[PDB]
């Protein structure tokens, strides 16, 4: 089982699933091997009904698509569509929060409100919305309207790109025609240009892809901004992770998916219904997180994280998961089938994200609290049905310190320098105590033993004094293996990094260091890392492609992860991906994405499936940036 | 060669290509066989990097996607993305015309103007834009702004859906949640809901697809509306089609793609540069059409149609094609390679549609006439380079009567009844002289001997007194085989249909009948057929699903054709498709699309690859509608 997952709680549940004859994601993977090499290399096209077309990576015919589409066109078009689909997911998330804020401040959804006025005003100021002498609800209405306006063409470009990056970077991107005109506009234009008989030049196609990836960045940043207004900007928090946070005697309710509009209300209402759960025989309601909705409520409320990503079915296999409340994205639809075996009540809530065999509850912002109670009562009913059923919850959990929004990091740093809080970080980059910064992002992937790349790479970087930040299931992987427990600083961190984490931690009244890895939140909260990196660039007077900052999507899976990787490259970062994207069938496209794009944006992809090799390559990328600044390394 | 194309001019050029060693679309098809059956059935998914996933149509594992996606989810998600891509192509076309009109009336593009004020005012009235006492340029500005507004969410739904269908049909669609909220909004929501871990219920997925297909309908109707304002509403016209319209002694310039913003200016400017072409040794400039841009200038200017779709390379093989001026969509990228062999100058003009090895000319509305001259001079230069080269132009062409916009058809009918012009058509439906109406639409497809399904099906329907209208490459197929020549009415038409075409033709001062098939224009001009059918419904007091009207995408290829077929079903029409769409891997999805959707929208797909069988099925569908109205059949 350790070839499937390095998580020991997951290994225990894989044995239980095998005993009980419950098919898992890993079983369905094994049943799929060997996978189609045309698809794995990207040399397959189904963009019209003359297909499917494929191209042999090597050898004889077929060499070209039926319409004349070359390998480099086919690969570029497929990649572009994956970027657009990722952008659409982050677009939809942000759009649904923008409508939630608009409803809140127009008096249409009283369960929602402006919880962070400070953030609201700073966003309004960044966008040029006047605040002085205005009511909050009117400022927020203007912010929500500006968010919705970024989805379409208007007299300005996408402001959640142009107002969040340094002017020098916007200038570079503008010179190459890469600034998005509208978020959904770019998604549609990708789908158009990649349809049959349209764009057929790899470089032109890929520039469109870079531009659409910035539409994805805008959706991420908009999503974080609006979620923080509505639900609070995260601050440091301490909780736990892994399956051991389930409690046999409680109603265990997992929030799963991505959008907190739903999950954040569940958290509040669950506290109300504690007595009603005790009436049913439970100790209370135990809300736990799966995937990124779980990260959202972990970051804001300290809700413990149950599991992530590839191992999500394992929470159910314990027998103790009474409900799984879903919104959208990264939900294995197998959960609806597995629930028949495990007793779990799987509940969908979004009109455009239903699963055959799952109970659907039509959530509406206008009735959020009512819907939450309907949902939690189904969960209580399910708990009662397992009175006296044995469960097997692995007694495995880790301590997780998290909540490191960029505002939190700046505040923590300000304890070392009150009016120049970035300077202490830059000082230690310059003197070598911090070699650089690495953002771990993205998913787990059944092709990679779960968490293996994240932890292998992270260990090597931390020993080399790299400051490591993480989001999404990269944060999930690191938290479930102790990387967010400050007790592990001595073991994991080089001396210089330990010194820095210790100084900051002690200066914030903690008696101990910051954790080895800083949890910056969900996948949309990769935007928080952008905010931090752009602020560092501005403080140093350079563009992002001169900073010793890298990213690693070490076990990427979702189209969203491809979009995030592509905009990391586009804003100037060396960007590792630890799974093969479907590009290796075209050497010209691979060359553009791993080399020549350097001369456009300064970033570049690092495709490397061996994690020890990937870490050496990330260190070389960091150290090249150090040398470019004239620093020792 | 007659197994590849039933067009004798195409057969002649296939022999020339074979002699000269020039690879064609049919050669690349043969090199691709046998094609992947997982893709052909729709049982392949590449929506995340855990894939590719495939499902055996029958037999043993794999039975399910790695994430748990069933066959019916995989098939529905792939179909939805094809609909969204089609919508994006028609979206982009309409959007680029909306920007062209806005620029024209804001004084920014003087080569463009309001050519049809009548149409402008009728559109403004349909949309509720006030006209009385307003300047045309201000009315048009409001129309252009309303067009752009339909791409995003606002306080109204998509008006180019809700104002173009009868209220009863809008009510049916609204009750099922199928009215689009915004064109690019729906495209993005499709890409979101079909991404990994989101929508996983076939019925829910397919309802999203129906809704996105209405976004496509809106793009089509908007495109026709704006093109008519800018370039004139078509009226009856007589010209010719097939390769014989090329002239060895002229500068032969093909306009190819879809958007007339470009091609319509080429047509005007080409007339200016006649003397400049004679200076170079030519008789003049001979503009000819390929694909739908060719239909646009055929319908409005009588520009002869050279070829269509699958056979586009053959125009080049003659050796006489001096230039091919491209915008976007349905352009085989092979043309850029073939030009090295044939001497043709292939010119791209749109930023998002480039082809490696083709000359790019950055067309801008603001400089349209300048760009046109730059482009036509490259063509003249190319003509000079083939002084004394032998060419082989097949001496094959047909006479084409076309220009049957819905306004034209109504006007023609008004010669038989001035204040009730639809009544004479309905009278002859009722008395049986017209059995019903069939719209042929869509592409050719290399899998089907070119034109074979269109002509086989059309012959059977015409003998059964069906009124046949056609658009796109369905019109192209029928025109190249004589179906738009009134000389062929006696041979092709049943007695009742002949009587009706003759009465209308003679009453319009023609001495002869209308042609056997009425050419209603380009693929976006399928919207014209909707206008006609909706007017018939309104005049009869019934919804479209009670009318004896059917559609046939008899040789479908492009994602746009899938979108058109799906919205034909959604507005209530029995809709034949003569190529296999990638649905047969899921019986539940096939059952929904060919049967149970009847109970939602009243329309349904008819999947039938045998054209004689398809014609019998279309006749049965028509006759069922007749019986439902209590008519004999
Ligand atoms: S777009 Fe070209 S390569 Fe793709 S399926 Fe169609 S013919 Fe084949
Ligand atoms: S990291 Fe990937 S699997 Fe995890 S929640 Fe984000 S997109 Fe989904
Ligand atoms: S979305 Fe599911 S079925 Fe599709 S490639 Fe990913 S794991 Fe396979
Ligand atoms: S009918 Fe098809 S091939 Fe022809 S121009 Fe329209 S979408 Fe293209
Ligand atoms: S041939 Fe396998 S992914 Fe298309
Ligand atoms: S396995 Fe051939 S289309 Fe994917």
Q: How far apart are the first and last CA of chain A?
A: 40
Cβ of A122: how many Cβ atoms within 10 Å? 17
CB B151 within 8 A of CB A184: yes
Instruction: Tell me the C-alpha distance between A422 and A418, whole Å.
Output: 10
- The two three-digit tokens of residue A569, written as one number: 């490259």
Mutation site for B-interface testing, chosen from A30, A49, A149, A346 by largest number of B Cβ within 10 Å:
A49
Cβ of A410: how many Cβ atoms within 10 Å? 15
- Burial tier of A155 (Cβ tally within 10 Å: 0-12, 13-18, 19+): exposed
Residues with Cβ within 8 Å of residue B432, at least 6 apart in sequence: B465, B496, B631, B632, B633
Instruction: Tell me the C-alpha distance between B279 and B318, whole Å.
Output: 24
Q: Which residues 48-67 in chain B show a CB within 8 A of chain A?
A: 48-54, 61-67
Length of chain A as a residue count:
633
Closest alpha carbon to B597 in B207, B175, B174, B84: B207
Closest alpha carbon to B299 in B219, B383, B218, B241: B241
- Burial tier of A387 (Cβ tally within 10 Å: 0-12, 13-18, 19+): exposed
DSSP per residue over A107-152, as a string? TS-TT-----HHHHHHHHHHHT---TT--HHHHHHHHHHHHHHTTS
3-class DSSP assignment, residue B258:
coil
CB A220 within 8 A of CB A524: yes
- The two three-digit tokens of residue B551, written as one number: 């559609």
**DSSP secondary structure code for residue B255 in this structure:** E
Which phi and psi (to 5°) does residue A185 adopt? -55, -45
Instruction: Tell me the C-alpha distance between A456 and A222, whole Å.
Output: 32
Q: Cα–Cα–Cα angle for A372, A379, A352, nearest 5°? A: 55
Instruction: Tell me the C-alpha distance between A212 and A187, whole Å.
Output: 7
Collect all residues of chain B within an 8 Å Cβ-Cβ radius of residue A447.
49-50
Interchain pair A68, B354: CB under 8 A: no
Q: How far is B82 from chain A (nearest CA, A)?
A: 7
Interchain pair A330, B196: CB under 8 A: yes
- The two three-digit tokens of residue B512, written as one number: 């002869």
Closest alpha carbon to A435 in A251, A618, A557, A199: A618
Instruction: Tell me the C-alpha distance between A565 and A544, whole Å.
Output: 15
Site of tokens 């609006």: A226
Instruction: Tell me the C-alpha distance between B539 and B274, whole Å.
Output: 48
3-class DSSP assignment, residue B624:
helix
Q: CA torsion angle for A77, A79, A84, A89 (degrees, to 10)?
A: 150
Helices (H), B419-512: 422-431, 452-463, 472-479, 489-492, 495-507
Q: How far is CA A632 from the centre of its chain?
A: 33
Task: Tell me, in angstroms, the distance from the centre of ligand 4 to residue A451's CA.
Answer: 48
**DSSP secondary structure code for residue B465 in this structure:** T
Site of tokens 């908009």: A222
Q: Which residues 188-207 in chain B show a CB within 8 A of chain A?
A: 188-202, 204
**DSSP secondary structure code for residue B200 in this structure:** B
Closest alpha carbon to B185 in A184, A191, A213: A184
Closest alpha carbon to A573 in A218, A217, A330: A217
Collect all residues of chain B within an 8 Å Cβ-Cβ radius of residue A92.
188-189, 192
CB of B39 shorter than 6 A to ligand 5: yes
Mutation site for B-interface testing, chosen from A191, A340, A607 by largest number of B Cβ within 10 Å:
A191
Mutation site for A-interface testing, chosen from B67, B90, B353 by largest number of A Cβ within 10 Å:
B67
Q: CA torsion angle for A170, A188, B329, B558 (degrees, to 10)?
A: 150
CB B77 within 8 A of CB B591: no
Helices (H), A432-558: 452-463, 472-479, 489-492, 495-507, 526-540
Q: Which residues 411-450 in chain B show a CB within 8 A of chain A?
A: 445-447
Instruction: Tell me the C-alpha distance between B188 and A212, whole Å.
Output: 12
**Cis peptide upstream of residue A62 (ω within 30 degrees of 0):** yes
Q: What share of chain B is helix, strand, coil (3-state, %, to 5)?
A: 50, 10, 35
Length of chain B as a residue count:
633
- The two three-digit tokens of residue A371, written as one number: 């819907």
Q: Which residues 274-313 in chain B show a CB within 8 A of chain A?
A: none
CB A574 within 8 A of CB A593: no
CB A560 within 8 A of CB A441: no
Instruction: Tell me the C-alpha distance between A528 and A233, whole Å.
Output: 11
Closest alpha carbon to B486 in B525, B458, B455, B514: B514
- Ligand 4 atom nearest residue B310's Cα: 3
Q: How far is B566 from chain A (nearest CA, A)?
A: 15
- The two three-digit tokens of residue B156, written as one number: 């109204």
3-class DSSP assignment, residue A400:
strand
DSSP per residue over A236-278, as a string? -EEEEESGGG--TTSEEEEEEES-HHHHHHHHHHHHHTHHHHH
3-class DSSP assignment, residue B49:
coil
Facing B199 at nearest CB: one of A352, A557, A579: A352
Pocket of ligand 1 (CB under 6 A): A 45-48, 50-51, 53, 65-67, 69, 196
Q: Which residues 109-168 in chain B show a CB within 8 A of chain A?
A: 148, 151-153
Instruction: Tell me the C-alpha distance between A455 and A611, whole Å.
Output: 9
Site of tokens 């309104």: B538
CB of B52 shorter than 6 A to ligand 5: yes
Q: Does B88 touch chain A (CB under 8 A)?
A: yes
Q: What is the resolution of this structure in A?
A: 1.7
- B353-390: burial string, b at 16+ Cβ within 10 Å, e else: bbbbebebbebebeebeebbbebbebbbebbeebeeee
CB of B36 shorter than 6 A to ligand 5: yes
CB B322 within 8 A of CB B251: yes
Strands B466-471 and B436-440, by their bridges, are parallel
Instruction: Tell me the C-alpha distance between A504 and A415, whole Å.
Output: 7
Q: Please list the residues that pair with B400 across neighbouring strands.
A: B239
Instruction: Tell me the C-alpha distance between A22 and A30, whole Å.
Output: 14
Site of tokens 């340029």: B137
- Burial tier of A385 (Cβ tally within 10 Å: 0-12, 13-18, 19+): exposed
Which phi and psi (to 5°) does residue B310 adopt? -60, -30
Q: Using what technique was this structure determined?
A: X-ray
Collect all residues of chain B within an 8 Å Cβ-Cβ radius of residue A561.
49
**DSSP secondary structure code for residue A596 in this structure:** I
CB B538 within 8 A of CB B166: yes
Closest alpha carbon to A15 in B377, A58, A5, B218: A5
Site of tokens 């299931």: A473
Q: Please list the residues that pair with A53 across neighbouring strands.
A: A45
Residues with Cβ within 8 Å of residue B294, at least 6 apart in sequence: B254, B255, B256, B263, B288, B303, B305, B306, B308
Instruction: Tell me the C-alpha distance between B275 and B296, whole Å.
Output: 26
Instruction: Tell me the C-alpha distance between A116 and A108, whole Å.
Output: 19
**DSSP secondary structure code for residue A48 in this structure:** B
**DSSP secondary structure code for residue A541 in this structure:** T
CB A618 within 8 A of CB A438: yes
- The two three-digit tokens of residue B625, written as one number: 């509608």
- The two three-digit tokens of residue A34, written as one number: 């060997």
**B42 backbone φψ class: left, alpha, beta (φ>0; ψ -120 to 50):** left
Interchain pair B46, A582: CB under 8 A: yes
Site of tokens 């693929």: B523
DSSP per residue over B308-346, as a string? -GGGHHHHHHTS-EEEEEE-SSS--THHHHHHHHH--EE
Which phi and psi (to 5°) does residue B329 adopt? 85, 130
3-class DSSP assignment, residue A215:
helix
Instruction: Tell me the C-alpha distance between A153 and A182, whole Å.
Output: 5
Strands B44-45 and B53-54, by their bridges, are antiparallel
Closest alpha carbon to B121 in B102, B105, B134: B134
Instruction: Tell me the C-alpha distance between A546 and A85, whole Å.
Output: 30
Closest alpha carbon to A315 in A290, A337, A341: A290
Q: Which ligand is nearest to the CA of B43?
A: 6
- Burial tier of A591 (Cβ tally within 10 Å: 0-12, 13-18, 19+): middle
What Å distances lie between residue A555 and A393, A464, A475, A570, CA to CA? 26, 22, 12, 20
Instruction: Tell me the C-alpha distance between B265 and B285, whole Å.
Output: 14
Cβ of A113: how many Cβ atoms within 10 Å? 15
HSE-CB of B524 using CA atoms within 13 angstroms: 34
Q: CA torsion angle for A40, A44, A48, A51 (degrees, to 10)?
A: -130
Instruction: Tell me the C-alpha distance between B150 and B179, whole Å.
Output: 12
**How many helices (H) does chain B have, and how many strands (E)?**
27, 16
Collect all residues of chain B within an 8 Å Cβ-Cβ radius of residue A51.
35, 39
Instruction: Tell me the C-alpha distance between A484 and A454, whole Å.
Output: 13
Instruction: Tell me the C-alpha distance between A337 and A321, whole Å.
Output: 14
Closest alpha carbon to B477 in B86, B13, B10: B10
Q: CA torsion angle for A333, A337, A343, A349 (degrees, to 10)?
A: 40
Closest alpha carbon to A479 in A26, A12, A9: A9
Q: Does A581 touch chain B (CB under 8 A)?
A: yes
Q: Please list the residues that pair with B253 across neighbouring strands.
A: B287, B323
Instruction: Tell me the C-alpha distance between A434 and A466, whole Å.
Output: 6
Q: How far apart are the first and last CA of chain B?
A: 40
Q: How far is CA B496 from the centre of its chain?
A: 29
Beta strands in B341-431 (DSSP E): 345-348, 359-360, 398-402
- Burial tier of A430 (Cβ tally within 10 Å: 0-12, 13-18, 19+): middle
Collect all residues of chain A within an 8 Å Cβ-Cβ radius of residue B183.
188
Beta strands in B329-397 (DSSP E): 345-348, 359-360
Cβ of A54: how many Cβ atoms within 10 Å? 23
Instruction: Tell me the C-alpha distance between A212 and A216, whole Å.
Output: 7
- Give the residue on A whose Cα is nearest the Cα of B443: A49
3-class DSSP assignment, residue B388:
coil
Q: CA torsion angle for A331, A333, A335, A340 (degrees, to 10)?
A: 160
């Amino acid at each position: 089982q350790n070839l499937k997952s390095t998580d020991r709680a997951v290994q225990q549940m894989l044995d239980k699933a095998k005993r009980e004859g419950i098919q898992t994601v890993w079983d369905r993977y094994e049943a799929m091997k060997p996978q189609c090499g045309f698809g794995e290399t990207g040399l397959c096209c189904r963009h019209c009904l003359q297909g499917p077309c494929r191209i042999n990576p090597f050898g004889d015919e077929p060499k070209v698509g039926i319409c004349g589409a070359t390998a480099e066109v086919i690969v570029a078009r497929g990649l572009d569509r994956s970027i657009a689909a990722g952008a659409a997911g982050h677009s939809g998330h942000a759009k649904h929060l923008a409508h939630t804020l608009k409803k809140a401040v127009q008096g249409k959804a009283a369960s929602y409100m402006i919880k962070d006025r400070t953030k609201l005003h700073s966003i309004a100021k960044r966008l040029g919305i006047p605040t002085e002498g205005q009511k909050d609800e009117d400022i927020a209405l203007e912010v929500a309207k500006a968010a919705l306006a970024d989805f379409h063409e208007k007299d300005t470009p996408v402001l959640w790109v142009t107002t969040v990056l340094p002017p020098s970077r916007v200038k570079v991107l503008s010179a190459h025609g890469l600034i998005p005109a509208g978020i959904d506009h770019e998604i549609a234009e990708i789908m158009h240009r990649t349809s049959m008989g349209c764009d057929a030049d790899a470089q032109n196609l890929l520039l469109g892809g870079l531009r659409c990836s910035l539409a994805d960045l805008a959706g991420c940043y908009m999503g974080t901004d609006l979620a923080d207004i509505l639900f609070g900007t995260p601050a440091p928090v301490v909780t736990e992770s892994n399956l051991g946070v389930l409690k046999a005697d409680a109603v265990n309710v997992a929030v799963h998916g991505h959008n907190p509009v739903l999950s954040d209300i569940i958290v509040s209402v669950s506290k109300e219904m504690e007595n009603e759960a005790r009436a049913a025989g439970a100790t209370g309601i135990n809300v736990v997180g799966i995937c990124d909705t779980g990260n959202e409520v972990l970051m804001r409320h300290g809700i413990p994280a149950c599991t992530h990503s590839v191992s999500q079915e394992m929470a159910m296999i314990t027998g103790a998961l009474d409900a799984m409340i879903l919104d959208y994205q990264c939900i294995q639809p197998s959960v609806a089938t597995i629930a028949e075996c495990t007793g779990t009540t799987v509940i969908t809530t979004m009109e455009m994200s239903k699963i055959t065999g799952a109970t659907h509850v039509n959530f509406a912002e206008e009735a959020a609290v009512e819907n939450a109670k309907q949902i939690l009562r189904l969960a209580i009913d399910t708990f009662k049905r397992r009175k006296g059923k044995p469960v097997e919850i692995p007694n495995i959990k880790t301590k997780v310190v998290a909540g490191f929004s960029t505002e939190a990091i700046i505040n923590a740093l300000s304890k070392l320098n009150a009016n120049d809080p970035l300077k202490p970080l830059i000082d230690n980059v310059v003197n070598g105590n911090i070699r650089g910064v690495c953002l771990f992002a993205g998913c787990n992937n059944v092709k990679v033993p779960q968490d293996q790349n994240f932890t292998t790479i992270a260990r090597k970087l931390l020993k080399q004094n790299v400051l490591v930040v993480a989001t999404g299931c990269g944060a999930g992987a690191l938290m479930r293996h102790g990387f967010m427990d400050p007790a592990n600083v001595d073991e994991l961190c080089g001396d210089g990094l330990k010194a820095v984490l210790t100084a900051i931690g002690e200066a914030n009244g903690l008696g101990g260091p910051l954790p080895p890895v800083l949890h910056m939140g969900s996948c949309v909260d990769n935007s928080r890392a952008v905010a931090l990196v752009a602020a560092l660039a501005n403080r140093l007077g350079v563009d992002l492609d001169r900073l010793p900052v890298v990213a690693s999507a070490a076990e990427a899976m979702h189209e969203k992860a491809v979009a995030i990787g592509t905009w990391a490259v586009t804003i100037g970062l060396p960007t590792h991906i630890g799974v093969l994207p479907p590009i290796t069938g075209s050497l010209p496209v691979t060359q553009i994405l791993t080399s020549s794009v350097k001369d456009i944006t300064g970033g570049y992809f690092i495709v490397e499936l061996d994690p020890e090799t990937a870490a050496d390559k990330l260190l070389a990328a960091i150290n090249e940036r150090r040398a470019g600044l004239g620093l020792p390394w």
